[PDB]
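Lab notebook, page 48
Experiment: co-folding of the full assembly
Goal: obtain a model of how the components sit together before planning crosslinking
Operator: M.T.
Materials (sequences as entered):
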Amino acid sequence: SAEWELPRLRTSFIFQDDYKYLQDLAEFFDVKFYPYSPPGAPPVFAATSKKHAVICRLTQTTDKDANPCEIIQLIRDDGNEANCASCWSKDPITDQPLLCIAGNEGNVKVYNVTEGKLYRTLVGHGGGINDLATSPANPYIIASASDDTTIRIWSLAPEHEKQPCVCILGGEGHSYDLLSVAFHDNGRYVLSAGHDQVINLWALPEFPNEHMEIPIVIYYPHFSSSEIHNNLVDCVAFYGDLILSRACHEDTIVLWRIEGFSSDDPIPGPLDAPTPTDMTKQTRSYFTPTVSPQSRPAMFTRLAQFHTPDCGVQFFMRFRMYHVPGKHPILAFANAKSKTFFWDLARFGEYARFMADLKEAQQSYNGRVVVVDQGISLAQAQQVHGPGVGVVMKPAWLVPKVSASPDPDSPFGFSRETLQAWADMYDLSNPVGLIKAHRSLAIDGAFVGRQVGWSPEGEWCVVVGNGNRALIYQRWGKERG
Amino acid sequence: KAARKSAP
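Observation: model returned without errors.
Model output:
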């Protein structure tokens, strides 16, 4: 059972200050779970501070007082740069884990973590690196986003060893420092965003399985917009074909879509891309649908806004989705004022089905509707109340405090305050509405969230941030009372 | 007014 269960705080740790001699200065900027372990293996994450990579294993415990977190490796970057970015790859010959770390010097350091060794360095960027992402379709392909305003795509495959830069995303798509890069599941589309307030989608060509003397240069994104947000953008992800992004000063994570974009369609080529012909258009797209009453059809649709209060003027704060077949998709993000927020996306759909049914029943039976919790069948509740009364099955998680109940003690419907509270959390009808978190957990101290990670099976969520602190939330625990 | 990357 327990598919509806959301996480709770289980463990926290403070890793020693490692930057005060080189604002309070120490931060965990990144955390990433190793994704290539066999099903069921204990989950492993790397947390990246300005100077160290802290590699931890999580094991579920029966003892509430026991420590599920063990630190199995600790690497110091003994150079003179601050790091802020990581991703995982694998050695193409040994299949051993590779941890990629980058920061303000502008090189990607690739570490053999099990042996505690530098495997190689990726050199080429002209400024600091702010983000790294590994391709889901190919674990040897890594994208880096930089202050040089470009994205470089690298291959760790042996055939590209002499010249590991396979692609540069350049031209004039971006004009300022990049903060975020993300791959589509198919490995052929890349999202990028930063200080210029532009979110770009790029289509990558197939990279040959041989030595490339030069990278393939892409001059134009296939979709471009500075219109979704009104501020710098510091975190971009795909959610299937949909897009999630956040900007500074807004207190939201925006779910939106590119009109006409489907990853089932063939991958467009470089010369299908639009070009900025009119400097007054702040959105352009190859994907645009041809049928609309507007002369220039809408190129994107804002779908929903997750409310993320009290981020203030803070930026460099990233959210993360747990998205695995057979489990509920969960969004997690920590703000700049000591809270962690969770949304279970599968609640939306059940709530929607429940209010459609409740609305139908109210119209058909003149408000004579009795709701009964799921977990008594529909058929047998209908016998009990008779054929004059509508019966609606309500999800068990949907807990009380479409028209409201006539009076407080009526047997039909719910109070206005019940309905409002539910709507705040679950109603998706307003693209510029604010969706309250399904769960909001307080953090002791003053904590700014930098990054969130989920274990492969979704039982752990690790949030990292300032003061080199890590917060480890759990669900489906084995703890005995 | 101005955006900030570091913790307050």
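Interpretation: Residues 349-426 of chain A form one domain.
Next step: discuss with group before ordering constructs.
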